[PDB]
């Protein structure tokens, strides 16, 4: 029939390049016969604060409330807040998830951060049994599309701000891959606010061209979970024999699994 | 007679996070500190940047840009009063303690929003004064983080990976960027599977540390003097500093790894 | 706690239980280091009728006068009547607002009703941009303290008068929450004039005990405004996908958002 | 030759509310009604209950209670003359029309005050005779409300919530409590966004309705016969009526929802 795509947008202004890049992605994907659902978080007045109000039924323990535990029960028993559930249905349907946002304080905007917190509940988005490459969204692909005010030189190995690969790691590994997603190469649009209108149009056309064949792309490299002992008594440490195979190599596996050695160039930006 | 701000991002008074805020307040007051708080959930703090944050005339309502508009609003004094209140707390504060649970490898959304609305240009950073030359070089900040995951999971060989990498965007990208000297984070791992007697110990450990907090060495970040702070040079590391570093085996920091090894616990232990 | 509290009182007699409960609240709060400001509306000879006299400057349109529009301009340009402005300053300062009044005709007294009408002006207390949980007083907490002549059985589900939750809804949702307030559990003191002296003393002591730790209480549940399309073309209706998630559930969200189903027990009286 | 009272709570003669008062007067006179008015703003009506409302000897000036004192003052005939004047209008009136703009989900303060000062015990209610057995069971009342908000906002799925809930305290708690049979309210939503052609239609609709107003079915309120009207029983619903209602899916009314569903438009449409 054709595949489904979710576009999460974290910018308040319709006049923004971020909004322009959401519209371009929708356009490009529909024209290739994709169904396209959106979460325009500001337009939705999405609520990004985790609270008791997120559970609409009986709390297991109202006197000693813990959001991890309570939210998971509420999912299983089906009395999560309906605004959460609506976003979860969009994700279950979605084969590709595009996150369009401006980098703010080296991270996702608060409203997108809150979306992850309220929507990516246990049992739904991760278990513990099944982390990382074995997680519930291993069927799905995700891509970050980020704009910055700072130039790309500032996020180079020798830039004042430092390696962009380090900045992306918590989001791409810690949030997206943790839940199973195969993470595609991020679309980095540097110093957008010093780019003249003719060149922005080019960037949009570049973005649209990429989305034509997005599904065929190689994902970023993360250490398979098979390299680790996935149980508590072992501490989720990297297997003793994998440490032995890696002792000799000069490069580490990834930004987070640098292993006290060099990080593979553009681990979080380019695939191999 | 120094001042301390405690920012707390947890909704429940029954939490260990709340317990660690109370312990810090206690310990600091007893050493003659003034202690101001921002309990963000109790304040029902609003973490979403919007036009409503500027209370006066916009420079350009048809083409609104939060960076530029917020900065004018600071200079002309028509920021939203809830923002201004937090800024006054910071101007007064010598030490800032951020108490929060790690959520999705980061600060909670409400604390993230606080940074976004409160750390406005000209007030918290300019670009002519970045990093060690920034407006808060007089001040010290420390993260106090709790996790659900065990510390083995955030070791070099842990499933989740090096905690130094996770802390970098916050400690360098937000705190140091604005000038703060960043102290060793208080990392309290897998708190919900720590027995009661050991939690009591952790609180007492926290209180003991805060007695002599001010004397501590800060974490190492590359001085901005190692870089060409102008656009034509690209804010790249000076050509002669690259020459001095060519030979060394370790990089400077997590973000300035320079394609080499990261100094062990760059974001966790001081030099 | 160097926090501020406003106590609005709508009873004419100093000999009243209502006055006794104002005094008890002031006592209890001061002793916990609160600043306490009062609006004793009868003692102030407060004027509760909206008129042109409420605007002291130039009317925008004297031939076709509309209090909503004119009052809002007068706030922005700073020429509201000084008696209104005085009350507004009390509100801006106040973290907690306590309304102490006798139920009169299933509602607030006329003088308190007038206070709402003259003091809760647009831009100050509400905009249509920011309604309900996004409103200007989301930082503040409010509580109703109501006395009745009728017994509590009369306002039970099977009482002659009917559910008290229905009676409170217009005030707590329509007035307090509309302006942003987090609304705490109302203090309902039923049939006070047929309570023996020893039990009245108990009620006062109960009230004082509650106010010690008032700030830590959970607020009443109102449907978040994030469940709705906050714009005119959509009709401020509940989002289409939230209605889909709620179609199946047996209980409605609140007294006003009952959705043609059962109302959550004591939605306007107890928190969850 | 029946009589009608029109109570109006709007200050401006240029208002749609005033236009709807004039239309009702017109329509009713033309059908041979006598029409008395209470234009509360024009009367400079005083809506605050005070001691000044009793003009004779108080029973207990040191411990004053408005319920008790006002009732004695009615029986002994020394109520304030402005109250008495309004009471005479009510005694004469067969139909009472309340024309007002919704203000804060309620009647305006001045109309609220009118109820408080005019609807005194013994005159408008006793505890002997509440609801359908009350003194005004001979009379009919109708609310004519204008709103600024659109009707979608007061639908089951509207931001503001069910308008049936909003009307309940007024129609049941004030009007029916005193005996009135309450007719379907005339709801004129978002009048200030209605073009002139459609306003003319609404007025004509109002006038057409008033021609045959007296024949209309009233709104459904639970008869007081479903309850034990005595204090020892607590004015609770009879044990055998609860038994008849156990099985039904819909409750009786908005206030007597009985923990179940409210009958659709209980306070807006007759059954
Ligand atoms: C709180 C906060 C923190 C921040 N922190 C960081 C940080 O840590 N690091 C960092 O690098 N940056 C940071 N920034 C900067 C931020 O990343 C940039 O402001 C953002 O990336 C710019 O993207 P935009 O879509 O908002 O741009 P806009 O300025 O909204 O858009 C750029 C230009 O494109 C124009 N345009 C829009 N659509 C079109 C179209 N279809 N065709 C042609 N022209 C078009 C616009 O009118 C405008 O002139 C921060 C900003 C904020 C508010
Ligand atoms: C949305 C979300 C995302 C998350 N993502 C991550 C993630 O990416 N990585 C990660 O590692 N974790 C994650 N977590 C987990 C989070 O780090 C932990 O839940 C948190 O750190 C636990 O601290 P707490 O204060 O919340 O614990 P609590 O359960 O509130 O406290 C722990 C125990 O201490 C007790 N206690 C309370 N006060 C005292 C006292 N005074 N003295 C002694 N004992 C006391 C409590 O009663 C309880 O038994 C996430 C959680 C959420 C909600
Ligand atoms: C116009 C009007 C309409 C009304 N409509 C309704 C209605 O629709 N529904 C309804 O249920 N009720 C209604 N009522 C009744 C009203 O709610 C009650 O009369 C009111 O709540 C009683 O409170 P009070 O403070 O006036 O009581 P009071 O009678 O003034 O006080 C109660 C008792 O407590 C004593 N007392 C005072 N101070 C102290 C103290 N410090 N310690 C101990 N004892 C003390 C007093 O002397 C007295 O004996 C209405 C009343 C009016 C005037
Ligand atoms: C303090 C306060 C609180 C409020 N609270 C609420 C609330 O909680 N909820 C809510 O929904 N609303 C609320 N409102 C708004 C109120 O409900 C509306 O403003 C009011 O109902 C609109 O009717 P009006 O008579 O005032 O209209 P107007 O605007 O005075 O008149 C309506 C239009 O009809 C025209 N018109 C006048 N006479 C005629 C005629 N003879 N023929 C044809 N056209 C004519 C007028 O010129 C105008 O264009 C509140 C208002 C105030 C002042
Ligand atoms: N990390 C951050 O978020 C960050 C840091 C610094 C600056 N900024 C943003 O960048 C702005 C910097 O402005 P500025 O005063 O430094 O000037 P500018 O950088 O916008 O213009 C001057 C410089 O631009 C460069 N440049 C390259 N191509 C150019 C072209 N075609 N035309 C003109 N200049 C060209 C040149 O090196 C020149 O020295 C800030 O106002 C802010 O918006 C963001
Ligand atoms: N709810 C309450 O508690 C309360 C309290 C007091 C007053 N009120 C009432 O609420 C009113 C608030 O006014 P409002 O916010 O409803 O005004 P509004 O936003 O409805 O007025 C502007 C209208 O014009 C339309 N419009 C104009 N140009 C347009 C265009 N080019 N394309 C599309 N649509 C266009 C807008 O969509 C909108 O419907 C007050 O004046 C008062 O009457 C309500």
From Swiss-Prot, chains B, D:
Top-level EC class: oxidoreductase
Cofactor: FAD
Localisation per UniProt entry: Cytoplasm, Cytosol
The keyword GTP-binding is assigned to this record: no
Keyword line: Cytoplasm, FAD, Flavoprotein, Isopeptide bond, NAD, NADP, Oxidoreductase, Phosphoprotein, Ubl conjugation
Catalyzed chemical reaction(s): a quinone + NADH + H(+) = a quinol + NAD(+); a quinone + NADPH + H(+) = a quinol + NADP(+); ubiquinone-10 + NADH + H(+) = ubiquinol-10 + NAD(+); menadione + NADH + H(+) = menadiol + NAD(+)
Function (record text): Flavin-containing quinone reductase that catalyzes two-electron reduction of quinones to hydroquinones using either NADH or NADPH as electron donors. In a ping-pong kinetic mechanism, the electrons are sequentially transferred from NAD(P)H to flavin cofactor and then from reduced flavin to the quinone, bypassing the formation of semiquinone and reactive oxygen species. Regulates cellular redox state primarily through quinone detoxification. Reduces components of plasma membrane redox system such as coenzyme Q and vitamin quinones, producing antioxidant hydroquinone forms.
UniProt-recorded name of the protein: NAD(P)H dehydrogenase [quinone] 1
């Amino acid at each position: 029939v054709g595949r489904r795509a979710l576009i999460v947008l974290a910018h308040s202004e319709r006049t923004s390049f971020n909004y322009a890049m959401k519209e371009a992605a929708a356009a490009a994907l529909k024209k290739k016969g994709w169904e396209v659902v959106e979460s325009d978080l500001y337009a939705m007045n999405f609520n990004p604060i985790i609270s008791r109000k997120d559970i609409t039924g009986k709390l297991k323990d109202p006197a000693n409330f813990q959001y991890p535990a309570e939210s998971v029960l509420a999912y299983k028993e089906g009395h999560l807040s309906p605004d959460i559930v609506a976003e979860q249905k969009k994700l279950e349907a979605a084969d590709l998830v595009i996150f369009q946002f401006p980098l703010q304080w080296f991270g996702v905007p608060a409203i997108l951060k809150g979306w992850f917190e309220r929507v990516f509940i246990g049992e739904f988005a991760y278990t513990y049994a099944a982390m990382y490459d074995k997680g519930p969204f291993r069927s799905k692909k995700a891509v970050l599309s980020i704009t910055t005010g700072g130039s790309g030189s500032m996020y180079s190995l020798q830039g004042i701000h430092g390696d962009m690969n380090v900045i992306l790691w918590p989001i791409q590994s810690g949030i997206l891959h943790f839940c199973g997603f195969q993470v595609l190469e991020p679309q980095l649009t540097y110093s957008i606010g010093h780019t003249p209108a003719d060149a922005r149009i080019q960037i949009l056309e570049g973005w649209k061209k990429r989305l034509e064949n997005i599904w065929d792309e190689t994902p970023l490299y993360f250490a398979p979970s098979s390299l680790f002992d996935l149980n508590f008594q072992a501490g989720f440490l990297m297997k003793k024999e994998v440490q032995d195979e890696e002792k000799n190599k000069k490069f580490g596996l990834s930004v987070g699994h640098h292993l006290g050695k060099s990080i593979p160039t553009d681990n979080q930006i380019k695939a191999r």
